[PDB]
């Protein structure tokens, strides 16, 4: 057990508009219908804002 990233790279975990998320920062999309849950973690790669969570099916 140890920390996952230096706090410098964790201070750039933000909550905002997908259109203003550049690199050197990760995006979190909070859920509305559910209070504490999250919807997706996102990271831009080539202008597109892709997810870091692998899709899981039945």
């Amino acid at each position: 057990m140890k920390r996952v990233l230096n706090l410098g790279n964790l201070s750039r975990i933000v909550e905002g508009d997908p259109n203003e998320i550049t690199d050197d920062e990760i995006l979190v999309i909070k859920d509305k219908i559910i209070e504490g849950k999250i919807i997706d973690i996102q990271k831009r790669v080539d202008g597109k804002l892709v997810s870091l969570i692998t899709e899981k099916y039945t």
């Binding site: 905002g16 508009d17 909070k30 509305k32 219908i33 209070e35």
Partner: protein
């Protein structure tokens, strides 16, 4: 209800129209009197204490004469419509304090520097549909507004089911969620109130309000969660109290101006306006000029009030008789 006068204003009530002065029996009977020519106009008004008569109007010196339809004096209660802002979100976001701020102007004072604020609070939960939010928001408003120990009644809260869309359902501090059972509550209505009124003491007045919203944190930014719309009202004040306070004031130009001040040592004045009815108003303006050096005018206003049956029947009868006896052409209602 003190008003401004162009050197004077007098009031006479027309509870019934007569043909001659030999028929003035009841304490509201009136009749217009004028010469066989058209040189002077005056009214024989039956008072509760005998016949009287207005000042004499020189028809060469009549400035303006016009009636009102009794609906130009009704005050429509300012109605609002609160709603969730679809742009932000068409539903509440769990974990956010959906506060509402009712800003009141013309609180106890009479200026607008005299302000007063009343709040509502709804902390949203997961799965809180919109109807439940409006319900809980309306109730929080009622509770915070009408605490049994809150002197002035400020606003009336309402709710509208999307099924009806017209029949607003009330929400009092005695109301309970159990009483509000529907699930398609579309919006929250807020409306003015007829403040208390006392003849000669407490004039007809209202407290203006505007629903102001507080910020919530939607996806990343602080944004207002609602919409304060000014919808067309559906309720009026029937003008009865304005005329009563008008008579109260305009009968001091014709009598006791103290109206109760030195209490045991007063005169008792009777009033013929029924506050609770609705009146249509006739108003005449004119002036008096003197001779060689006394050319200065003294403008005057003689005011009449009749009862509006909805068709302006009585006031039309007055205007007919006045025009027949004076040659004027006061336009009917």
């Amino acid at each position: 209800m003190v008003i401004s006068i162009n050197q004077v204003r007098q009031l006479y009530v027309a509870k019934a129209l007569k043909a001659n002065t030999a028929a003035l029996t009841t304490a509201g009977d009136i009749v217009p009197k004028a010469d066989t020519a058209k040189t002077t106009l005056y009214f024989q008004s039956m008072s509760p204490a005998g016949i009287v008569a207005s000042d004499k109007i020189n028809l060469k010196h009549v400035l303006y004469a016009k009636a009102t339809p009794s609906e130009a004096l009704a005050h429509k209660l300012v109605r609002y419509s609160v709603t969730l802002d679809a742009d932000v979100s068409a539903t509440p976001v769990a974990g956010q304090n959906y506060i509402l701020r009712l800003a009141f102007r013309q609180y106890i004072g009479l200026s607008e520097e005299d302000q007063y604020f009343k709040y509502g609070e709804v902390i949203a939960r997961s799965g809180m549909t919109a109807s439940d939010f409006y319900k809980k928001m309306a109730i929080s408003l009622a509770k915070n507004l009408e605490n049994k120990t809150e002197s002035t009644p400020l606003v009336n809260i309402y709710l509208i089911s999307a099924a009806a869309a017209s029949t607003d359902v009330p929400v009092t501090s005695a109301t309970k969620e159990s009483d509000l059972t529907a699930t398609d509550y579309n919006q929250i209505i807020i409306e003015e109130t007829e403040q208390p009124w006392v003849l000669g003491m407490m004039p007809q007045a209202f407290i203006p309000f505007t629903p102001q919203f507080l910020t919530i944190t939607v996806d990343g930014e602080d944004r207002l969660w609602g919409v304060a719309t000014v919808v067309t009202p559906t309720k009026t004040v029937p003008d009865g109290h304005l005329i009563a306070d008008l008579e109260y004031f305009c009968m001091g130009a014709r009598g006791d101006i103290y109206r109760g001040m030195g209490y045991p040592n007063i005169i008792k004045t009777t009033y013929l306006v029924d506050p609770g009815a609705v009146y249509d108003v006739l108003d005449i303006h004119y002036f008096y000029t003197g001779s060689n050096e006394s050319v200065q005018k003294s403008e005057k206003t003689i005011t009449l009030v009749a009862v509006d049956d909805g068709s302006h029947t009585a006031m039309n009868a007055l205007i007919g008789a006045i025009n027949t006896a004076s040659g004027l052409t006061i336009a009917t209602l």
